[PDB]
Structure formats: structure tokens, C-alpha cells
Design an enzyme around this catalytic site. Structure first.
Site, PDB file in Angstrom:
ATOM      1  N   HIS A 133       0.788  -1.225   0.000  1.00 13.69           N
ATOM      2  CA  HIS A 133       0.000   0.000   0.000  1.00 13.69           C
ATOM      3  C   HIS A 133       0.826   1.283   0.000  1.00 13.69           C
ATOM      4  CE1 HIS A 133      -3.366  -2.586   0.575  1.00 13.69           C
ATOM      5  NE2 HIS A 133      -2.972  -2.965   1.778  1.00 13.69           N
ATOM      6  N   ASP A 170      -2.346 -11.305  -1.645  1.00 10.29           N
ATOM      7  CA  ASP A 170      -2.905 -10.775  -0.414  1.00 10.29           C
ATOM      8  C   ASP A 170      -4.376 -10.423  -0.642  1.00 10.29           C
ATOM      9  OD1 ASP A 170      -3.675  -8.333   1.323  1.00 10.29           O
ATOM     10  OD2 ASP A 170      -1.853  -9.036   2.311  1.00 10.29           O
ATOM     11  N   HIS A 172      -6.066  -7.883   0.224  1.00  8.18           N
ATOM     12  CA  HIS A 172      -6.269  -6.471  -0.058  1.00  8.18           C
ATOM     13  C   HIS A 172      -5.628  -6.098  -1.392  1.00  8.18           C
ATOM     14  CE1 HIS A 172      -6.350  -6.715   4.434  1.00  8.18           C
ATOM     15  NE2 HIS A 172      -7.404  -5.935   4.267  1.00  8.18           N
ATOM     16  N   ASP A 263      -3.823 -13.205   4.272  1.00  9.32           N
ATOM     17  CA  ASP A 263      -5.103 -12.875   4.893  1.00  9.32           C
ATOM     18  C   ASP A 263      -6.308 -13.408   4.127  1.00  9.32           C
ATOM     19  OD1 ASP A 263      -4.988 -10.981   2.745  1.00  9.32           O
ATOM     20  OD2 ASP A 263      -4.452  -9.360   4.105  1.00  9.32           O
ATOM     21  N   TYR A 303      -3.047 -12.133   9.317  1.00  4.74           N
ATOM     22  CA  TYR A 303      -3.197 -11.726  10.709  1.00  4.74           C
ATOM     23  C   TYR A 303      -3.639 -12.820  11.667  1.00  4.74           C
ATOM     24  CZ  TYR A 303      -2.395  -7.555   8.220  1.00  4.74           C
ATOM     25  OH  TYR A 303      -1.805  -6.603   7.427  1.00  4.74           O
TER      26      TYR A 303
END
Ligand SMILES: O=C(CCCCCCC(=O)Nc1ccc(I)cc1)NO
Ligand SMILES: [K+]
Ligand SMILES: [K+]
Ligand SMILES: [Zn+2]
Length: 355
Positions: A133, A170, A172, A263, A303
């Protein structure tokens, strides 16, 4: 030769000072290392030194203004750190963040070095902070520096690489990587991510598959957005077989970088997906077929301490050459609708997609 592994205890030396339960915590990487050991995988890897990224390396992606403000973080008081963190979306700060973030970037560059010079076959950095990000002049989403975006440009400069493929599995969207290379046809970015028409973080219309890149970059940015929760291994396997790998073989990259977040693994408290950790053995295996298998994975999100450890372990088994596992699973309606639409948006730029 073998499979490289980078990890340093400095990766545990920052954490969220205002919430003891923040999901981006040091126990992420120590749990991965514990399982890699108990599973006998750690000892089968070539241990590779980390190193600190240089400013010139950072300036391949980030502005001098942002680098200097970052370097200043190691001498700010808590309030001054908390006050600068609040200027960003979903980010905390810590006196040691800048130092660990430099080693997080450098860990990837060390692996790119050994993989590009045939010292190693592939490698995996068990690093935090994550990176995908981070943007040219902004922190974002638990990230300070964009590890893989720096590594991509570094490989192009130091190792004369023409084309780099970045695969981001991932859960995201790595919008930072997208933005950095949006106009750049030499770096193909592929991201599969939870999206839900924008309701899921980072809530960007730019995460939809209609964002295919701009200008010369058109066709070199590929988003696969999931619009229903609970995706499984078959959804990802289908995506890879009929979308990414056809485009990959057609693109003929000389290096593959994986934003290796976990995740999307079942049990993650954020991603809301149901992917089994062993699925990443299969996805990793597929990627070894491109670029002479010159493949570097770098830890992004993930996580659930146990689910992320198992996801790293399944990936590592494939890097090491172990047989592909049997998967107890076997795509949903929502997933296929997403794959068709992404193929449609990217159809005019890739012959391997054209049926
Ligand atoms: O994995 C990632 C980075 C994820 C960034 C997501 C931001 C929104 C969010 O979930 N924030 C949050 C704040 C405090 C607590 I306690 C739990 C969660 N990129 O791949
Ligand atoms: K992604
Ligand atoms: K691109
Ligand atoms: Zn993530």
C-alpha cells in the site's frame, strides 16, 4: 542452487503503541519462523543476510521529501509520531518503524540479488512492515515503504532486467503498487483481492478490473476483484489457470515478485475468505514455470498467526521442490463472474486470453 530465506529480529522491533491488540504485530513473523522450524523447512533453506535499503534505492519509488520525513521518524516524540500517523489512512508509527522498514525493503533486494545472479533458485523474505500500500509520498495501510515496487525497479537498474511480474495474492488490493507502475508496461501488476464494489478496504474504484493501466501501461495492470466473501482454493486455482498464467507466459517476465499476503487463508480475522493454506503450494508451483523460476516472495498481510504460518509453510514447500499437496477442496458463481469480467477488460491486450 537452493531456496533463500531472510529474517531478522529487527522485524519484531516496532508495534502499535496505542493498541496492544493491533493485528499488525511482531508475533506475525515470529510465529512464521517457529512453524518453519518445527516443520523442518527452515533448516532446508539458505539463510540470507538482510540489509538496510539505501536512499538512492528508496528514491527509485519514493520522493526525497517523503524519505527525509520518514528518516526523521526515529527521533520524534510519541505525540509527534501519533500526530504524523493520523495524517494517513490506517497506519501507526513507532520509534523503530523506519529502521525495520529499511530492513524490510533490503531483505527483498538481497533475495533479488541472489536469485538474479543464479546464486539461489528462489527465496522468501519473512518481513514486516508490509509494503504494497505504500505510495510515492504517503504511508498507507500498515505500510511505510513499498518493498516490492522498490525491488522491481532495483532489479531493472542493477540487474538489467527488462520485465518484472508482480503477483499480489494478499486479500487487499495493492493500490500503491498499481499507482507506481500505472503507466509502466515493463512492470506487470496482477492483484486478486476482496473488493465488494468498494465496501472493503481500501474502498477504491481503482481496485475494480476496469483499471487496466493508463497510456503505455494499458493492459499491464490486472485487477481481479472478489465481490462475495468465503472464496476458496478452487476460486484462486481457476483465476490462476485461465487468467494470470496465460498472461504471464505471454508477458515473458525475467523476474517474478509475489506480494505474499495470507489474509485470504481460512481463519484470518480480516479477509473473510476460506482459502486453505495448501492452496498456496499450488499457486507457488504455477509461478515457478515462468522466468526460469526466478521467484521472490515477500510477506505482506496475514493476521491469524497460525493460518499465516501455515500459508508461508505451504508456499515454502513448493519453493523447495516438494510434491504438490492433495487439496481437500474443489469455483463459485461470484468468482467466475469476476474472472469473466476481468478477462473481458483485458481481452484486447493479451492473445492468450482470446477465446
Ligand atoms: O493487510 C493489509 C493491510 C490492512 C489495512 C486495513 C485497514 C482497515 C483495518 O482493518 N483497520 C484495523 C484497525 C485496528 C484494528 I485492532 C484492526 C483493524 N494489506 O494487505
Ligand atoms: K491482492
Ligand atoms: K503496470
Ligand atoms: Zn492484506
Amino acid at each position: 542452487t537452493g531456496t533463500g530465506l531472510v529474517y531478522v529480529d529487527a522485524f519484531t522491533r516496532f508495534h502499535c503503541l496505542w493498541d496492544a491488540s493491533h493485528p499488525e504485530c511482531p508475533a506475525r513473523v515470529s510465529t512464521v519462523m517457529e512453524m518453519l522450524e518445527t516443520e523442518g523447512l527452515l533448516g532446508r533453506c539458505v539463510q540470507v543476510e538482510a540489509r538496510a535499503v539505501t536512499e538512492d534505492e528508496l528514491l527509485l519509488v519514493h520522493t526525497k521529501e517523503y524519505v527525509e520525513l520518514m528518516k526523521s521518524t526515529q527521533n520524534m516524540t510519541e505525540e509527534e509520531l501519533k500526530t504524523l500517523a493520523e495524517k494517513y489512512d490506517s497506519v501507526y508509527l513507532h520509534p523503530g518503524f523506519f529502521s525495520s522498514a529499511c530492513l524490510s525493503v533490503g531483505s527483498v533486494l538481497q533475495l533479488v540479488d541472489k536469485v538474479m545472479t543464479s546464486q539461489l533458485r528462489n527465496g522468501f523474505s519473512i518481513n514486516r512492515p508490509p509494503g504494497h500500500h505504500a505510495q510515492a509520498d504517503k504511508m498507507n495501510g500498515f505500510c511505510m515503504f513499498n518493498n516490492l515496487a522498490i525491488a522491481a525497479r532495483y532489479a531493472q537498474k542493477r540487474h538489467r532486467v527488462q520485465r518484472v511480474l508482480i503477483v499480489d495474492w494478499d486479500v487487499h488490493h495493492g493500490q500503491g503498487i498499481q499507482y507506481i507502475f500505472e503507466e509502466d508496461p515493463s512492470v506487470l501488476y496482477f492483484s486478486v483481492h476482496r473488493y465488494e464494489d468498494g465496501s472493503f478496504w481500501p474502498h477504491l474504484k481503482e481496485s475494480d478490473s476496469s483499471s487496466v493501466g493508463s497510456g503505455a501501461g494499458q493492459g499491464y495492470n490486472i485487477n481481479l476483484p472478489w465481490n462475495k466473501v468465503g472464496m476458496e482454493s478452487g476460486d484462486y486455482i481457476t483465476a490462476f489457470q485461465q487468467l494470470l498464467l496465460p498472461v504471464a507466459y505471454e508477458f515473458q517476465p525475467q523476474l517474478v515478485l509475489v506480494a505474499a499476503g495470507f489474509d485470504a487463508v481460512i481463519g484470518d480475522p480480516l479477509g473473510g475468505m476460506q482459502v486453505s493454506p495448501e492452496c498456496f503450494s499450488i499457486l507457488t508451483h504455477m509461478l515457478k514455470g515462468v522466468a526460469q523460476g526466478r521467484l521472490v516472495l515477500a510477506l505482506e498481510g496475514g493476521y491469524n498467526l497460525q493460518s499465516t504460518a501455515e500459508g508461508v509453510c505451504a508456499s515454502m514447500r513448493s519453493l523447495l521442490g516438494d510434491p504438490c499437496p492433495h487439496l481437500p477442496s474443489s469455483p463459485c458463481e461470484s468468482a467466475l463472474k469476476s474472472i469473466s469480467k476481468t478477462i473481458s477488460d483485458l481481452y484486447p491486450f493479451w492473445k492468450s486470453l482470446q477465446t
